[PDB]
């Protein structure tokens, strides 16, 4: 139509990025994230972003959704950090978990200044990059998962 007269006139602006960057400051899970090379993992649990202990990294519940931040040194500079952020959706995860994992992946991207490249990883469809994150035999799928955050309307 005329975008400038419309309710999308401010999409794509620095203002949009600033508001969303501010919102990402209110998530405790991101504090200290992406500070060194390695893999950091959280699981969605009733809408909350919950750290996965390092001893469990690579094991994923088929009923759940996860965020996996891979921090690495880019080719351009061996002393700086770059990011791939993968969200992993179990074959039996519920809609609230997958939707929260998607939204919070964007939020972590915001928190890290837009630098992360995002990857949607459905169980059985994981990218070559995702398969490369874990040592030989490190990627394991576990039965079950945590309960949905949704209340079921009868």
């Amino acid at each position: 139509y005329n975008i400038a007269d419309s309710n999308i006139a401010n999409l794509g602006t620095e203002l949009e990025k600033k508001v969303k960057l501010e919102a990402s400051q209110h998530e405790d899970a991101w504090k200290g994230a992406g500070k060194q090379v390695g893999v950091e993992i959280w699981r969605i649990q009733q809408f909350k972003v919950v750290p996965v202990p390092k001893k469990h990294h690579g094991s994923f519940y088929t009923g759940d959704s996860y965020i996996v931040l891979s921090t690495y040194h880019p080719k351009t500079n061996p002393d700086k950090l770059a990011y791939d952020v993968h969200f992993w959706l179990g074959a039996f995860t519920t809609q609230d978990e997958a939707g929260t994992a998607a939204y919070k992946t964007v939020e972590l991207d915001d928190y890290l200044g837009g630098l992360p490249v995002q990857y949607r990883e459905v169980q059985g469809y994981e990218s070559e990059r995702f398969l490369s994150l874990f040592p030989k035999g490190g990627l394991r799928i576990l039965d079950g998962g945590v309960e949905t955050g949704f209340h079921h309307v009868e």
Binding site: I8, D96, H151
Partner: protein, 362 residues
């Protein structure tokens, strides 16, 4: 503190509470007044439609009767959900490319009339993408008023590529009303419009090959279906079943020169940077009631394949719950404290007025 999610569609209110898996109140966005020249709302207006003239306060996604829209919102809060709005942060929805004044007045009424403590207005298609568990894809949302296409990459909608057509379910209902006259049926009144809307929802479908289907319909009665009217008379419909939603692909059926929904989807993808087009083609997400016709996903797949490069991998995602995808996406996002951090507070509204909606809601 529980947030309310109110998806004010052109045709239906979907309302409920953040954290629920479905809206608890779904009812027609209509106000009825005596047909003989004081009013009824929603389900009850529909129930008494025998004596009422029915009016939709939203046309093509834009509120065109603000007094009646206030009645709709009042009814949603006090009569359906039975909540006190001053106790509930409220998430509303909107089609993209609406005039800015629409959400300015939504914001004014929510704060000045209903005294909500906080509120946000979301673009409907974005909520559907999150409901599908994606950050990248192109949503085709079609309700009763608007068909919109929103390509989204890494969680950001691409405004230069957003497309909108003011052709959706109500136009299809009106067209079915028109073409049913060819059979000698007369559906004309606002009450009769609701009857034809039900016929459309129950019996219409998208033909995979329109011209072939027209020939099948003339060869025998194999495609015909019967329908019982409220007064007991039984009518029969044939090629109207698929001619009606054919309008989405051929808007000239109602005299519009616009591109059809397949072409608009293709054009939207082509407005995006080339390196992301493969991801958009593989992630077409349908949402809204007008995407519920049997056969529509297969027809979309066929038509986009004909427009796209010959090797392009194309996928249409058609969630079974897509009449409620926008609402469900809102329920998810409104359950997140960081998303609520961006909402307009009553104090911010008091100090800044309606203009603040453009600085907080994206």
């Amino acid at each position: 503190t529980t947030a309310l999610v109110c998806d004010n569609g052109s045709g239906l209110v979907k309302a409920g509470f953040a954290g629920d898996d479905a809206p608890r109140a779904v009812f027609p966005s209509i106000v009825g007044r005596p047909r003989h020249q004081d009013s009824y709302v929603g389900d009850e207006a529909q129930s008494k439609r025998g004596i009422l003239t029915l009016k939709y306060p939203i046309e093509h996604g834009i509120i065109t009767n603000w007094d009646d829209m206030e009645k709709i919102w009042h009814h949603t809060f006090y009569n359906e959900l039975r909540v006190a709005p001053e106790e509930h942060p409220t998430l509303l929805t909107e089609a993209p490319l609406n005039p800015k004044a629409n959400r300015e007045k939504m914001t004014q009424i929510m704060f000045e009339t209903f005294n909500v403590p906080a509120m946000y207005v979301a673009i409907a298609a974005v909520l559907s993408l999150y409901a599908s568990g994606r950050t990248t894809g192109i949503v085709l949302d079609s309700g009763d008023g608007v068909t919109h296409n929103v390509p989204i990459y890494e969680g950001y909608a691409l405004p230069h590529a957003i497309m909108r057509l003011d052709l959706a379910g109500r136009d299809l209902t009106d067209y079915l009303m028109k073409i049913l006259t060819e059979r000698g049926y007369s559906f004309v009144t606002t009450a009769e419009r609701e009857i034809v809307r039900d016929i459309k929802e129950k019996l219409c479908y998208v033909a995979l090959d329109f011209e072939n289907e027209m020939a099948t319909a003339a060869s025998s009665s194999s495609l015909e279906k019967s329908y019982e009217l409220p007064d007991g008379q039984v009518i029969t419909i044939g090629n109207e079943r698929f001619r009606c939603p054919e309008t989405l692909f051929q808007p000239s059926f109602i005299g519009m020169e616009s591109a059809g929904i397949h072409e608009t989807t293709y054009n939207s993808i082509m407005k995006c940077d080339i390196d992301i087009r493969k991801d958009l083609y593989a992630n077409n997400v349908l949402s809204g009631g007008t995407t519920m016709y049997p056969g529509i996903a297969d027809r979309m797949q066929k038509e986009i394949t004909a427009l796209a490069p010959s090797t392009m991998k194309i996928k249409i995602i058609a969630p079974p719950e897509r009449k409620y995808s926008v609402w469900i996406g809102g329920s998810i996002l409104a359950s997140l404290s960081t998303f609520q951090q961006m909402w307009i507070s009553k104090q911010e509204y008091d100090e800044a007025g309606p203009s603040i909606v453009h600085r907080k809601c994206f």
